[PDB]
Design a protein around this ligand. Structure first.
Ligand SMILES: O=C(NCc1cccs1)[C@@H]1CN(C(=O)c2cccnc2)CCN1c1ccc(Cl)c(Cl)c1
Length: 301
């Protein structure tokens, strides 16, 4: 029993983190095989920020300008190249701790674990979701750029996020490991801001199922709704539309609890319209949307 924000064990990723320094800027890199990946803004200077031409900035670099350190061991850079908004620094040594891995871009509403790192040293690990507006509500301080987000399937690390920036509202943005930003954010100085966000409906329903599995039942009712009528309510409360695919994805949890999805939808509608009247669900006084159906199954059997 119990239900927590649970991250994947981080050991396989810890062994991949290195420190990358260019000029006076130090941040984190990801060392896999004989390549270190890091944000390309490591080559920026304070004066470059309005409209850096990264192609020019990189042509002006040499391998010796990148200092890469894996703990107390310096790695020799033997090649450098840009891939979208990341840099690929080829090093003379393959990382002996390289896990089986994949680079995998995630969808809004998916979750992942973040290993926050400073000066190439892991500091902590927490669970995050990719918001509908392609930001993440992370916890990151100066020096954390190049920290990565990941999931683990069996022995294989699926890297899905590399950290690049903090937006004015305190939320975060970054890229996939191919260097392509999530959302309409750019690695240059602008007034960019997180766009309007919505609540991830399928995840709220998954979390309601988690609650039922853990003995919280007060919000259940005898009613069922139609998908159409539920989506009318969803729109009014800034929730994402619920699709039949979502209903299908929730099938296993519906079967385990004996509560049909559209029955749970009627409970959600009442919670949106009436609130919780001073009660809590899984220790929360608000509807939590950062657990996916898979996250719930993983933790609730
Ligand atoms: O968001 C940033 N600056 C505003 C922006 C300026 C241009 C685009 S965003 C980050 C903040 N920095 C942190 O270490 C940090 C702090 C807190 C939480 N996570 C990270 C240093 C680097 N800095 C940066 C510099 C140049 C570029 Cl181009 C980019 Cl993308 C990022």
């Amino acid at each position: 029993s119990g239900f927590r924000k649970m991250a994947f064990p981080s050991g396989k990723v810890e062994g991949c983190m290195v420190q990358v320094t260019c000029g006076t800027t130090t941040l984190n890199g990801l060392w896999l095989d004989d390549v270190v990946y890091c944000p390309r803004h490591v080559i920026c200077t304070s004066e470059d920020m309005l409209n850096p031409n990264y192609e020019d900035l990189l042509i002006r670099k040499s391998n010796h300008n990148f200092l890469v350190q894996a703990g107390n061991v310096q790695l020799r850079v033997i090649g450098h190249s840009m891939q979208n908004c990341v840099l690929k620094l080829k090093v003379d040594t393959a990382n002996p701790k390289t896990p089986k891995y994949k680079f995998v871009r995630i969808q809004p509403g998916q979750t992942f674990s973040v290993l926050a790192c400073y000066n190439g040293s892991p500091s902590g690990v927490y669970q995050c979701a990719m918001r509908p507006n392609f930001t993440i509500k992370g916890s990151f301080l100066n020096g954390s750029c190049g920290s990565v987000g990941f999931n683990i399937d069996y022995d294989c690390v699926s890297f899905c996020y590399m950290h690049h920036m903090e937006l004015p509202t305190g939320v975060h943005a970054g890229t996939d490991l191919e260097g392509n930003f999530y959302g309409p954010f750019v690695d240059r100085q602008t007034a960019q801001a997180a766009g309007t966000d919505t609540t991830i409906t399928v995840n709220v329903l998954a979390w309601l199922y988690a609650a039922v599995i853990n003995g919280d039942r007060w919000f259940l009712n005898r009613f069922t709704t139609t998908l159409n009528d539920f989506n009318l309510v969803a729109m009014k409360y800034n929730y994402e539309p619920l699709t039949q695919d979502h209903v299908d994805i929730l099938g296993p949890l519906s079967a385990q609890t004996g509560i049909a999805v559209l029955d749970m939808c009627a409970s959600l509608k009442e919670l949106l319209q009436n609130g919780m009247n001073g009660r809590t669900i899984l220790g929360s006084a608000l509807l939590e949307d950062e657990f996916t159906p898979f996250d719930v199954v993983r933790q609730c059997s």
